[PDB]
Amino acid sequence: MIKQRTLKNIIRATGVGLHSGEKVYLTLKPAPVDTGIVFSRTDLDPVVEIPARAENVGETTMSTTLVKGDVKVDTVEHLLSAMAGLGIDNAYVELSASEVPIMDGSAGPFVFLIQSAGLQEQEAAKKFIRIKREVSVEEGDKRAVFVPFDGFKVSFEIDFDHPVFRTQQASVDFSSTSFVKEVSRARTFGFMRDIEYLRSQNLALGGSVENAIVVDENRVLNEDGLRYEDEFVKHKILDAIGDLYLLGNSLIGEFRGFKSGHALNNQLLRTLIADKDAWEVVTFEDARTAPISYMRP
Ligand SMILES: O=C(NC[C@H]1C[C@@H](NC(=O)[C@@H]2C[C@H](F)CN2)CN1C(=O)C1CC1)c1ccc(C#Cc2ccc(CN3CCOCC3)cc2)cc1Cl
């Protein structure tokens, strides 16, 4: 039977917030059965805890933000991506500040920290949301879709009118392709012109080539270049996997993005939750006959 997983050991990590430019201390802790992923602002008295759930998403412009009163946690989607890919159900994310550290721009540092610590099976069935019906949202030229699928799969397409865009489409069946190998190293990215402006408005204060792909009109300015021919669309998939995890249960089904982002990914989540005709919660008495598979712990 497919069981809930938490961390075996606690993980301590250090970084900077992409927007805040603030140094932040990160502690990942095991958690009991049926906790979910809970973000916890330990710099406050009293300490403030926001479950990583679609109900707790704030104004979706720069990144995925969790909110509870006037306390926020900025840029959760990369860490949540990492935890999704390794199948982590239960964990406490402690932060000494408002923003999750950016690390290298990818999920890879987070995935390493998690597997280093190790994972622990817990005595309870894992709960899965299975897409039963197509559910689709559009706004202008953007679109984001759930389609039933005996497994877990994400496709994405982007279209920037810009010399640097290379492959702008990709699809990954995560039951036959490794999240760790193929998606987790995909780095966030930013246009020279936007970054010059946004910096001027006290935004992206922690950005650098050390944590972002920087791009002028013509080329990646990063000296050692890209990790993947298709890094940009691969990062969109990585962000999508994070936002999907705000459902609070692992997904059996497929996600398709067309120029989508946090805002419309969040509309799709809300529209899916709202239409109980479109999904069901299932468990599995036998892994050998389940449509998705997990690594050994
Ligand atoms: O938000 C950013 N990019 C959004 C990109 C990535 C995708 N979103 C994601 O990945 C989501 C959203 C979040 F990004 C995380 N997850 C979607 N997307 C788009 O579609 C873009 C709109 C086209 C971003 C990235 C890097 C910097 C930056 C920076 C930077 C880099 C270098 C320097 C140069 N300095 C030189 C001196 O040393 C310090 C650095 C300064 C700032 C600033 C920003 Cl504002």
Ligand SMILES: [Zn+2]
């Ligand atoms: Zn991202």
